[PDB]
Each structure stands twice: as structure tokens, then as C-alpha cells.
Design an enzyme around this catalytic site. Sequence first.
Site, short mmCIF file in Angstrom:
data_model
loop_
_atom_site.label_atom_id
_atom_site.label_comp_id
_atom_site.label_asym_id
_atom_site.label_seq_id
_atom_site.Cartn_x
_atom_site.Cartn_y
_atom_site.Cartn_z
N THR A 1 -7.71 -0.45 -16.72
CA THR A 1 -8.28 0.76 -17.31
C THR A 1 -7.21 1.83 -17.40
O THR A 1 -6.43 1.98 -16.47
CB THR A 1 -9.43 1.29 -16.47
OG1 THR A 1 -10.49 0.32 -16.47
CG2 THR A 1 -9.93 2.63 -17.03
N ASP B 1 -2.72 10.99 -12.06
CA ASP B 1 -3.03 10.76 -10.64
C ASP B 1 -3.23 12.06 -9.87
O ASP B 1 -2.71 13.09 -10.26
CB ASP B 1 -1.94 9.91 -9.99
CG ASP B 1 -0.59 10.60 -9.97
OD1 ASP B 1 0.28 10.22 -10.78
OD2 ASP B 1 -0.41 11.52 -9.16
N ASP C 1 -5.17 1.82 1.52
CA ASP C 1 -4.08 2.56 0.88
C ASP C 1 -4.53 3.78 0.07
O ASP C 1 -3.86 4.18 -0.89
CB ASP C 1 -3.26 1.61 -0.01
CG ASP C 1 -1.80 2.04 -0.15
OD1 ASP C 1 -1.39 3.01 0.54
OD2 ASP C 1 -1.06 1.42 -0.95
N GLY D 1 5.06 5.45 -14.66
CA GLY D 1 5.32 5.46 -13.23
C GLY D 1 6.13 4.28 -12.76
O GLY D 1 6.32 3.31 -13.50
N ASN E 1 -2.66 6.90 -5.62
CA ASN E 1 -3.51 5.81 -6.05
C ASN E 1 -4.94 6.22 -6.37
O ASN E 1 -5.80 5.36 -6.46
CB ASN E 1 -3.52 4.73 -4.97
CG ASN E 1 -2.12 4.26 -4.60
OD1 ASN E 1 -1.21 4.22 -5.43
ND2 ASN E 1 -1.95 3.91 -3.33
N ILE E 2 -5.20 7.51 -6.54
CA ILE E 2 -6.46 7.96 -7.14
C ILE E 2 -6.11 8.53 -8.50
O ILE E 2 -5.15 9.27 -8.63
CB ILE E 2 -7.17 9.03 -6.30
CG1 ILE E 2 -7.28 8.57 -4.85
CG2 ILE E 2 -8.55 9.35 -6.85
CD1 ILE E 2 -7.65 7.13 -4.71
N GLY F 1 5.47 -0.43 -6.80
CA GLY F 1 6.22 -1.08 -5.74
C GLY F 1 7.13 -2.15 -6.33
O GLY F 1 8.27 -2.30 -5.89
N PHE F 2 6.61 -2.88 -7.32
CA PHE F 2 7.31 -4.05 -7.85
C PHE F 2 7.73 -3.94 -9.32
O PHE F 2 8.32 -4.87 -9.86
CB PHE F 2 6.42 -5.28 -7.67
CG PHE F 2 5.97 -5.50 -6.26
CD1 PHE F 2 4.67 -5.17 -5.87
CD2 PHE F 2 6.83 -6.02 -5.31
CE1 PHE F 2 4.25 -5.38 -4.57
CE2 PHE F 2 6.42 -6.23 -4.01
CZ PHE F 2 5.13 -5.90 -3.63
#
Length: 553
Positions: free
Chosen positions: A263, A269, A310, A192, A315-316, A195-196
Site C-alpha cells: 500500500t 511517516d 518494532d 527511503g 514504521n508508522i 534495512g536491506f
Amino acid sequence: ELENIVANTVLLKAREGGGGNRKGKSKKWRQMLQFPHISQCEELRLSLERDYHSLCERQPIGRLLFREFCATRPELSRCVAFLDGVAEYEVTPDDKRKACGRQLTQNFLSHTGPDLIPEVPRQLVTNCTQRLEQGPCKDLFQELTRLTHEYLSVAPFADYLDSIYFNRFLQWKWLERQPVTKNTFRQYRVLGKGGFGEVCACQVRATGKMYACKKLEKKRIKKRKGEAMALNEKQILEKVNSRFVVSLAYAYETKDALCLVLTLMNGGDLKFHIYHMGQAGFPEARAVFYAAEICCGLEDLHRERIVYRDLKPENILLDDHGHIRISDLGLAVHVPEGQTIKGRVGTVGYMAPEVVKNERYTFSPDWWALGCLLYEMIAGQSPFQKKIKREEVERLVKEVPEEYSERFSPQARSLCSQLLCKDPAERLGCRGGSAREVKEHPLFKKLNFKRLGAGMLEPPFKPDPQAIYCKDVLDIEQFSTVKGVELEPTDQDFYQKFATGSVPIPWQNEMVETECFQELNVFGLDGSVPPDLDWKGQPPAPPKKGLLQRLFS
Ligand SMILES: NC(=O)c1cn([C@@H]2O[C@H](CO)[C@@H](O)[C@H]2O)c2ncnc(N)c12
């Protein structure tokens, strides 16, 4: 497009079982994990606070080593067995409980047999026999438990600290303090775009355990001035030891980036599973389950005064057995007791009204997002998002109530509604019950939450282990690696703050999970067979019968 199929087959192999007998471990791992000299441990001994709770309870290797120590003395060994029994008992279901509970009573409180502790008041014994048989409660043995720990935490603790077992622990600890670098791990294909930076799979060379590696590029951080965001996600994940939040095992640096080793969630996702996985959305039963896990996760964070800010499919993430864990905590932040915080931050679509309005809050925003998500999972579409622009959606959120399809059941509607109640003071979770009132919604009829939190409930979908649930390598974004920015002394001080090294609890777990602990820790078996001939090459008194037969016929 060979590259695609290559990287994929590699990763799956690593996930399979590395290279045979050694479960992903480098052929020179024993060297890599060589204990240090005892002298090399003193500096460290002094550093470590003499804390029962830290050294014997929180720190799994430390706990094992203590347990192991207690095995040498029966009075202790039996305590450990007792505590073990109660921990089980407390999690044993209602019907089986009294049956199990008596076995303990009979074993560890037989008035004819030896005493449990040196001084056990008699009145405290009779009370349990009585209290048990009529109404076996969860806090039945708390009286004895408390006294047992008070016992161990004083002398047997001291005796341990001053034993070989602690010398071993010191060495084990020395290893976790050793610096971590690029060379510690093997890298695989990316999974993936953060953001950074990239987020790729990886493997600890010495131990073969798989982790995800979130890279944050040193330059992209300075440009966006996201120093706070990076250190924050670190310090937070460093502290959180929840079953539903990705745990952090290492924090190190490279020339180009700062890494968090996390982890590894092989099931991918929830964004992927909602859209690129056949017909959009999930059946009710399924959607509910996750909402219930994600709930426990939020409970866990909130309970540590952390607001997430967020929540969203991206993000799950799903693990090998189809359970979930929250992730990307860049935007998360601590909420001091008796206070509130303001911060217009999040993702456009999932920020609740009061966030968008730039108002003060505590935990309200998360429960909102749980709603959005629980909506999105059944509905199969974001409740406020074909491309639209920022201002339009925010309006849609602030004023217009949600619009339902007919996939929703009766109760399924009420929950999402109550979570998406625009008044934060009247929103579910924020009225003054915290997670409890969300858990108590009738939509969760069927789920025993006590168990779910212990990971004892089976989900309704186990991923295919041979599947890689994300895009192929070349089918992934890659923003312009912008030049025009030099790294300076002021940044080095920050990188020092960030690059901590191995996170104790996780690290220790890693070693136990990869049988490195048992394999290496033990001592006295290898090369112990008393030898056929003494140093000067003569047999002992009397000589070994196996040698005589070997020396003649
Ligand atoms: N930081 C993380 O915890 C992760 C991010 N990704 C991938 O990178 C994307 C960034 O959100 C996600 O959608 C995942 O596909 C992950 N994939 C697997 N395990 C993880 N722990 C992560």
C-alpha cells in the site's frame, strides 16, 4: 539539482491522474489483461477447493461474480439484498437504528408477500417483530442471517459453480496466477532507505494503481543472513487483511533484489511529521487519535497471534486521508497459543525492559512501544534519547522512571505511565484485557472505537495531496554496495519460496478499484447491435428502417 525537482514532479503527476482519460493505464492494457481460453482454465478449476467462504465471501471479485449470478434469479437476488440490509443495519447508529430496522422487517418479512427462503419456520419470524420494537440489539437478525448463508452455501452455490459466472471467475483467477516481474510496473523516485534496500513509489502498468515497492537486495540479505526476516515480513503481510497494516499485493524478484509491493502511503511517516514539520510534536487531540489507530492496528495483529516488536515513528505511515498503517514487519513473529517467546530484538529506545533483559514474553513489548510513541508525539522527543550510547539508554529504561514536561494533560500522563509501567504483568494491555483495557482508558473519552475501526471517524489532519512528505532524492543515504559474495543454488530455492506473485485479496481489489473489472468483465453489450445485413449481404425479415433512409434520402 534538476534531478530532485524532476523526480518530484513526475511522482506528483502519476499521483494526480497519469495521462488523461486512462487513469495511469498503459495504452495497451486491454492486451495485457486479455482473458485466456476456457481450456486454459481447467488445470486451475481442479486446483481450486470448492469453498463457499473462499470463493463467495473472502475473494471480492469472486463475491461480485456470485452476487452478479444471484441477480439472475429473484429468490436469490432478494437474499443478497437482505444480507446487505442487515450488514448496514448492524453499523447504523443507535438513534437511526430502529427506524432503519423496521424497513427491513417490513420488506423482507411481509407475511402476505413471497417467502424469503423455501422453508422459513414461523416462530422465528414472530420473535424478531417482538424483540426489535423494545430493544433493537446488534445480533437481532443473526438467526435469519445464519439460515440465509446456510441456504446459499449449498444449492445456489453448486448452481453457480456450474454456471457461466464461474467460468468468468476462473479466467479472472488465471490472470492473477500469471507471473509478475519487473515489467509489470513503472518505477519512480526512492522514498527511503530500508534495512536491506530502497523503498520507492511504483505503478502497475496494466491498471495504473500506485503502490510502494520495498526492495530487498539479494546480496545484502545473504551477508546479514536475513533470509528469515525477509520471508517473514512477506508471509505475514500476505496473511494480514487489516485496515491499519500496509497490505501486500505482489512478491517478485529481479537480478539484484526481492520486492514487496505495498500500500502506498502518500502522507509519509510519523518520524517526518514529528520532527521536520514545524515545531516538534503534535497537539493532544492529534497525538491521541493516532495512538488510537495504532492501538487498533496492534489489536488486529495480536488477534492473529502476531507480536510486532518494532513500533516506532519510522514504521508508522499516513495515507491520502490522514489515517495510519503499521509497516516494516521484518521483526514481527507469531506467538503460538499457550506459549511464550524470547528474542532480544527491536530498536534501541523502543524495546521494553523484559526484551532488553532477554526474558520470555507474548505481546507486552508492543504496548510498551505504544507508550513510548504516545509519549514521543506529545513530548516532541524520545523519552530515552544529542547522541547517546547503547548501554546508557538501556539502563535509563530498566530503572529510571519517565520524565514529563507540561504539554501533557492530566489523563495524558496516566496512559503513557501505565503503558510505560516497567512491570510487564502490571502493564496496561497485559493484565488480561488486551486492547480492550487500553481502549477503555479515559483519555479516549471522545472516540467511538467501533467507528474508528470501520474508518468512519475523520482525523484532525488531512495531508496536502500536492506535498511530498519526505526528503529529496540526493539527500538520502546509500550504503557501500559491498562485493565479495557470490549467489549460489541454495539461495535460488529460497527465492522460489519468496517470489509468490500476486496476493489474491489485494490483487482482486486492485482490479475493482481501477474499474478494470467492470470494464473488462461485462459481456454482451459491445458489438451486439443486430446487424443491418445477414451474412450473405441481404437484409433481414423485415429490413432495418435506419438502413433504408441511409441508402436513399
Ligand atoms: N515499507 C513501507 O511500508 C514504507 C516505507 N516508506 C518510506 O521509507 C522509509 C523506511 O522506513 C519510511 O520512513 C518511509 O519514508 C514508505 N513510504 C510510503 N509508503 C509506504 N508503504 C512505505
